Design a protein around this ligand. Structure first.
Ligand SMILES: Nc1nc2c(ncn2[C@@H]2O[C@H](COP(=O)(O)OP(=O)(O)OP(=O)(O)O)[C@@H](O)[C@H]2O)c(=O)[nH]1
Ligand SMILES: [Mg+2]
Ligand SMILES: [Mg+2]
Ligand SMILES: [Mg+2]
Ligand SMILES: [Mg+2]
Ligand SMILES: [Mg+2]
Ligand SMILES: [Mg+2]
Ligand SMILES: [Mg+2]
Ligand SMILES: [Mg+2]
Ligand SMILES: [Mg+2]
Ligand SMILES: [Mg+2]
Ligand SMILES: [Mg+2]
Ligand SMILES: [Mg+2]
Ligand SMILES: [Mg+2]
Ligand SMILES: [Mg+2]
Ligand SMILES: [Mg+2]
Ligand SMILES: [Mg+2]
Ligand SMILES: [Mg+2]
Ligand SMILES: [Mg+2]
Ligand SMILES: [Mg+2]
Ligand SMILES: [Mg+2]
Ligand SMILES: [Mg+2]
Ligand SMILES: [Mg+2]
Ligand SMILES: [Mg+2]
Ligand SMILES: [Mg+2]
Ligand SMILES: [Mg+2]
Ligand SMILES: [Mg+2]
Ligand SMILES: [Mg+2]
Ligand SMILES: [Mg+2]
Ligand SMILES: [Mg+2]
Lengths: 101, 97, 94, 166, 275, 140, 148
RNA sequence: UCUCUUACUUUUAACCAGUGAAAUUGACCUGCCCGUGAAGAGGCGGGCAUAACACAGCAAGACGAGAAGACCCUAUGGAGCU
RNA sequence: ACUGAACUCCUCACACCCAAUUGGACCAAUCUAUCACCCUAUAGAAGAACUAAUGUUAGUAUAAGUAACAUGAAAACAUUCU
RNA sequence: CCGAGCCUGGUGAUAGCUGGUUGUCCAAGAUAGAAUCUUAGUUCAACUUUAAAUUUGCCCACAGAACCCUCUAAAUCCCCUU
RNA sequence: GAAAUUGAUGGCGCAAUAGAUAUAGUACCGCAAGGGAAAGAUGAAAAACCAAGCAUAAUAUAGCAAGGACUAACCCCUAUACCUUCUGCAUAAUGAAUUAACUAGAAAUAACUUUGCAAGGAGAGCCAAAGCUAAGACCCCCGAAACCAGACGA
């Protein structure tokens, strides 16, 4: 997915990321970086030298139980399943830009 | 509301009473005693099913054959009716034929 | 008012159905795709005689693998370790 | 059967500190197995609910329903016991905080119908409960004015958020 | 009666749960409840915060004077955390002042003082202590720990950190656990003010700018019960700020607040704090 | 009664807990609560597709609103952004419209710029120089 | 279901990542049994894994109590005060290890529906849209059809 | 009887008080029009209408209640009679 | 040009949508053998699991506080009157 | 409650007919006909399921499969390769 | 469906809708034969929180009553109860007021799996050209009008 992000923001990724909690990461696929007066747009992705977005793996959890229920009338067809999708909460520490235009 | 509101009285089982402690003894009477006695001779119970097993119809037939003359009147009538019904069911009803 | 006798779309007197420009364009697009398919199928690389037997070895080897898989079906092994591991159910501390 | 209403009068609170508001007295009374329908008793209970003891007695003395006399007797007994045992200073300084009618233990009888058929009568019995609270009756909830109603509407408008977005 | 025990046991557990829910027990400090070891808990506290606390200093910080009085009374029937709390409070105030002044050089001394007071206030410090488990390790004569005692214990912990690791590590701790509390907060949410128009007039006088002129930039539904008024403040016919409101006076007041935020450099889109 | 069920209370509760917030007897009577709860769970399962569809519809509506504010139509904006090779999705576009109006104005200006470049190319069809924004970055 | 369940917003206990990451888990109480097949996995975990986990997570106090139990349990107490009790009854060593690691990596916030997959305290940098954005201003602020 | 119905008394009725059934009832937060459809919609599609509840009447509908249709057919199902 | 599925791609995970019928993996509770000892484990058994049979028994609803039912009048409650 | 009483018993009569047939989860699974006092059913085929053995299964290149009949269809069968 | 012939000490039971119909063949019902119930729970001593239904607490536009949701109960959008039967049912086809309890798959042949022994197996009999022995694992409930026997009835 594409997330609109800012420093101190929280993001809920719907899977485990194979990262220890509190570990710092760099989000490399930054489509857009914007300020109050100017914005820079990638085609389709901005440069690594241009933008550096860093996050931290704050939490690793399981989603609340989701019910998957299948039912068909008059066919004795009834089924129930419970699924808990792994999730990771990340906190976006900083968004830095460099003069590389 | 079909659930009791209090714990049932604790059930204490003496795992080492005489019956449990000596259970199974002489089950190998035959192989360990020159086969003088068959293990089925250790079975205490109804005379018509000592060392014998079968379905309900066979059990009823055996009971009538072996103790039918000593049965009470209504008990024997019930046994005869049960044998009749079991015969009909086993020989005329069922998924497989 | 304005009833269609019986059931729509089946009877002798069905509800009229009209083709939209959208449907016409969709059918034309599919027809163009199939025309290109005709063109690309109209140019075989090898002839039938040239292709005769050029994949026979590979096909035979594939079927030999299938036959080996079919004939290797046989009950799995059984291990004293597997049987004895069940004693661990009553493993305790001291 | 349950008899918790009677026991509710046996609760003893710890002594109040001098710098504490005086706890209003509460007196629970009830009458069991009244030969009266609980549905009919409910109307009398609702009538006298929330009123002062004197006003409730006044209304009941002139209401024509049979349950009115029973409820009046129950209220008089409640007042007497509140004064004698629950340390209520003034008879008139009591109001009906709670008044409800409960189903009693009923008896089943047979009603004969026209063609050898029948119905199952129920000799209905009902309970009656009252809580008397010391102090003047709480003021009736005033109807919400246009000013407060518009204030609620404006609060609802202000609570709006941009839903389904960042 | 149905023979069996496990269903009855489950129903007894459910009845106990319902009884607890209907009559919840009074709160009890975690020390009384089972599975507690003070030394292990305090060591885990230090390691969790990732700081080399000296255990004696941390214990002295956690122990309060009221706890000492209660213990002496019980004995009838220890060094308190006063100095550590005082040192921690002084250092926290000075360090927060340094951070805030560096981040917002335009902010007035009054604004900096109010921000420091908000960050060190009972509410914020109490929340931080509760969510950092300072309350569990706190030794007090009553539970739940009152906010004043919790704040004193938290600042005693800060003072112990100062004595153990040093000013730099303590400043990092403060930046992490108190400077973060103003994230998402608004200038005047943290620093309550009255007469923002007066404050703006004074600030512009100090900066040698003509007194602002209130002006009706935009309006909607003026005669309705739900009007909108965008009022802008113009100095020398130059817009410094504009604010929305329901009435003209409210819009002007909010525009004054916006102008004050811009002047003090604490705008919503300001540079985020650097960690 | 050799063997009797003793857990029926908990078996009933497993459904009544999900039925507690219903109306009428559907929250009290198991014979009714079970049917209502099965229907509710089936609806919850089927509602994820509708949630995604309605989210996309809402994003499209909001993008249309913003594009109309800027004088553009949603199809033009989306297609011309794609041609510009900006791969912002509808969710992000709606978020920008709501929360970054100046960025969305810049994006709408870019989309209109590319639209006019395409119009110029079509009008002067031939080997005329490609539009500045029309040029496509090539990836290998 | 969502309508039949409480919901919350994505959040962190104390902005857990801004300054420094703090492990929210603080206490782990393992009720185990010397005897009983149910707690065989718990016993093996205590023997082979609990020490390594304890030294890996120095900020978590682990209390292993071996007492007669039919259902061995693990109680995780988090910094925010949340207490989550899980049954390790008839669970293998690997299952117990995964559960304990999940508890360690999990925050104390309730595991309920999260309304939004994101949470921004500063959603707008250029100014939240209002109806008067993208609306030109007129001379002397004259509303339509105004005469003067 | 009716053209052609009217007046009055009693019972019934409605209100107050006491006592107090019956069939029925999947749940109902129980509208109208057109179209659809298991071939006659309160529940489906498009429209329209629409604060909330009582009380008394009415019998157009809920294919209304009632009797596992007595008509008709079938069953290698009965029985009566010739 | 755009919109548009559970089609396809995308991140992660995958045994997890056909009636009758068929194969398989688990399993609630009960008793027995050993365990266990705030609710259990490995096995052996069986009256071993109920949203449905105009199902049976019991409770309470709905219809419904409805249909229905009752006591000639005054009085000193002697008595008189209709 | 007499086309032949009622009660008990044979009797749990029988019913190709109607109704019902209770934990979780996965998987395969809708196929020509023949006979039948038989077409409301059943048995055998066909289909389907499971397990096992083996090797060819499907698609299909030429070549090939009738005159009657003057013409006379979409196709089919067979079928190496692939 | 034979015969000759052969030889032969309690409970993995129920525990008040269960177990006897049984507290009793009593009450009650029928002229009679005959049918046939229900239920009770304190304590060592009485010489001491949970079904349905309601009430607390009636109700607000719209609709299988829920789901997606949402700041927000409703308002917004999506959604034609279930079971049985059928070619096909929201069907204006059946059943169901609702709660509690009870209430319905019995088994041989032959195969398959797993042991044991092995040209033999089996604790006479029986089978055997790898078989034999042992175990596991598949076969429901309610309902007629009827028929006959013996009683009881003018
Ligand atoms: N299987 C069985 N054993 C019984 C029964 N009644 C008694 N017994 C056995 O009879 C034995 C002696 O019973 P006791 O009562 O101790 O002595 P008793 O009165 O001399 O016995 P009896 O002579 O049998 O009357 C014991 O082994 C009992 O278990 C019964 O009904 N069944
Ligand atoms: Mg039609
Ligand atoms: Mg009569
Ligand atoms: Mg009644
Ligand atoms: Mg009345
Ligand atoms: Mg119609
Ligand atoms: Mg009416
Ligand atoms: Mg009709
Ligand atoms: Mg009818
Ligand atoms: Mg019929
Ligand atoms: Mg016949
Ligand atoms: Mg789509
Ligand atoms: Mg078991
Ligand atoms: Mg059963
Ligand atoms: Mg039930
Ligand atoms: Mg039933
Ligand atoms: Mg009533
Ligand atoms: Mg009525
Ligand atoms: Mg009447
Ligand atoms: Mg007669
Ligand atoms: Mg039958
Ligand atoms: Mg399948
Ligand atoms: Mg013989
Ligand atoms: Mg009995
Ligand atoms: Mg209740
Ligand atoms: Mg209807
Ligand atoms: Mg129907
Ligand atoms: Mg029918
Ligand atoms: Mg009906
Ligand atoms: Mg005579």
């Amino acid at each position: 997915r594409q997330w609109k992000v800012t420093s101190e923001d929280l993001i809920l990724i719907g899977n485990e990321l194979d990262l220890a909690c509190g570990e710092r990461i760099r989000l490399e696929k930054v489509l857009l970086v914007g300020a109050d007066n100017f914005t820079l747009l990638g085609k389709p992705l901005l440069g690594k030298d241009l933008v550096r977005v860093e996050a931290t793996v704050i939490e690793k959890t399981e989603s609340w139980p989701r019910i998957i229920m299948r039912f068909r009338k008059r066919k004795n067809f009834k089924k129930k399943r419970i699924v808990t999708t792994p999730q990771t909460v990340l906190r976006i520490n900083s968004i830095e830009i460099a003069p590389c235009l | 509301i079909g659930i009791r509101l209090t714990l049932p009285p604790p059930k204490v089982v003496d795992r080492w009473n005489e019956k449990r402690a000596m259970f199974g003894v002489y089950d190998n009477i035959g192989i360990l005693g020159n086969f003088e006695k068959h293990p089925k001779e250790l079975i205490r119970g109804p005379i018509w099913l000592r060392g014998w097993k079968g379905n309900e119809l066979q059990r009823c037939i055996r009971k009538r054959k072996m103790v039918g003359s000593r049965m009470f009147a209504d008990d024997l009538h019930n046994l005869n009716k049960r044998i009749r019904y079991l015969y009909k069911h086993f020989n005329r009803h069922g998924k497989f034929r | 008012r304005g009833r269609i006798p019986g059931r729509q779309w089946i009877g002798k007197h069905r509800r009229p159905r009209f083709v939209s420009l959208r449907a016409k364009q969709n059918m034309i697009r599919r027809l163009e795709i199939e025309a290109e398919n005709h063109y690309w199928l109209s140019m075989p690389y090898m002839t039938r005689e040239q292709e005769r037997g050029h994949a026979a070895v590979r096909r035979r080897e594939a079927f030999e693998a299938i036959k080996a898989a079919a004939t290797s079906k046989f009950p799995p092994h059984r291990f004293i370790a597997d049987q004895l591991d069940h004693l661990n159910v009553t493993k305790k501390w001291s | 059967i349950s008899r918790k209403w009677e026991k509710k009068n046996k609760i003893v609170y710890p002594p109040q500190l001098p710098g504490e508001p005086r706890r209003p007295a509460e007196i629970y009374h009830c009458r069991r197995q009244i030969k009266y329908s609980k549905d009919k008793m409910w109307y009398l209970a609702k009538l006298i609910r929330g009123m002062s003891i004197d006003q409730a007695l006044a209304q009941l003395e002139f209401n024509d329903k049979k349950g009115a006399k029973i409820i009046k007797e129950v209220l008089l007994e409640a007042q007497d016991m509140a004064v004698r045992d629950h340390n209520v200073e003034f008879r008139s300084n009591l109001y009906i905080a709670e008044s409800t009618s409960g189903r009693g233990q009923c008896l089943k009888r047979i009603r004969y119908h026209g063609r050898g058929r029948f119905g199952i009568m129920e000799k209905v019995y009902c309970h009656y409960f009252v809580k008397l609270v010391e102090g003047p009756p709480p003021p009736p909830e005033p109807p919400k004015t246009a000013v407060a109603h518009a204030k609620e509407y404006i609060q609802q408008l202000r609570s709006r958020t941009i839903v389904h977005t960042l | 009666v149905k023979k069996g025990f496990r269903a009855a046991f489950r129903f007894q557990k459910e009845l106990e749960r319902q009884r607890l829910l209907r009559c919840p027990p009074p709160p009890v400090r975690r020390s009384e409840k089972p599975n507690w070891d003070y030394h292990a808990e305090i060591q885990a506290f230090g390691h969790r915060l990732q700081e080399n606390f000296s255990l004696d200093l941390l214990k002295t910080a956690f122990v309060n004077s009221c706890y000492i009085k209660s213990e002496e009374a019980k004995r009838q029937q220890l060094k308190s955390n006063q100095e550590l709390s005082e040192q921690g409070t002084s250092f926290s105030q000075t360090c927060l002042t340094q951070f805030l002044e560096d981040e917002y050089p335009d902010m007035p001394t009054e604004g900096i003082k109010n921000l420091v007071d908000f960050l060190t206030g009972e509410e914020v410090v109490c929340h931080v202590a509760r969510n950092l488990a300072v309350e569990q390790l706190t030794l007090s004569e009553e539970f739940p720990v009152p906010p004043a005692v919790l704040q004193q214990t938290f600042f005693a912990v800060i003072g112990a950190l100062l004595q153990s690791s040093g000013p730099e590590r303590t400043a990092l701790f403060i930046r992490d656990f108190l400077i973060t509390q103003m994230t998402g907060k608004e200038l005047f949410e943290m620093w309550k003010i009255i007469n923002p128009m007066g404050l703006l007039v004074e600030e512009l006088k100090k900066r040698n700018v003509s007194a602002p002129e209130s002006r009706l930039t935009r309006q909607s539904g003026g005669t309705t019960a739900l009007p909108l008024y965008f009022v802008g403040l113009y100095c020398d016919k130059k817009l410094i700020a504009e604010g929305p409101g329901e009435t003209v006076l409210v819009a002007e007041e909010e525009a004054a607040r916006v102008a004050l935020r811009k002047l003090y450099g604490f705008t919503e889109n300001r540079r985020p704090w650097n960690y | 009664l050799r063997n009797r069920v003793t857990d029926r209370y908990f078996r009933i509760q497993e459904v009544l807990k999900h039925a507690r917030h219903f109306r009428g007897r559907k929250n009290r009577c198991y014979r009714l609560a079970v049917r209502t709860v099965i229907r509710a769970f089936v609806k919850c399962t089927k509602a994820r597709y509708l949630k995604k569809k309605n989210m996309r519809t809402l994003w499209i509506n909001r993008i249309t609103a913003a594009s109309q504010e800027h004088g553009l139509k949603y199809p033009a904006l989306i297609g011309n952004l794609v041609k510009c090779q900006v791969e912002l999705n509808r969710k992000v576009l709606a978020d920008l419209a709501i929360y970054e109006p100046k960025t969305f104005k810049s994006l709408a200006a870019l989309a209109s710029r590319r639209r006019h470049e395409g119009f110029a190319a079509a009008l002067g069809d031939g080997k005329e120089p490609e539009g500045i924004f029309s040029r496509v970055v090539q990836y290998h | 279901t969502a309508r039949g369940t409480p919901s919350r917003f994505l959040a962190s206990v104390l902005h857990n990542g801004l300054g420094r990451y703090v492990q929210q888990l603080q206490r782990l109480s393992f009720s185990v049994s010397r005897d009983g097949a149910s707690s065989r996995g718990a016993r093996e975990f205590v023997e082979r894994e609990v020490i390594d986990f304890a030294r890996r997570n120095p900020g978590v106090v682990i209390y292993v109590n071996s007492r007669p139990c039919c259902v061995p349990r693990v109680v995780a107490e988090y910094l925010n005060g949340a207490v989550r009790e899980e049954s390790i009854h008839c669970k293998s060593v690997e299952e117990i290890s995964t559960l304990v690691q999940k508890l360690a990596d999990q925050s104390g916030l309730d595991v309920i529906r999260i309304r939004k997959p994101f949470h921004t305290d500063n959603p707008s940098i250029q100014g939240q849209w209002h109806p008067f954005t993208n609306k030109p201003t007129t001379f002397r602020g004259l509303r339509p059809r105004e005469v003067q």
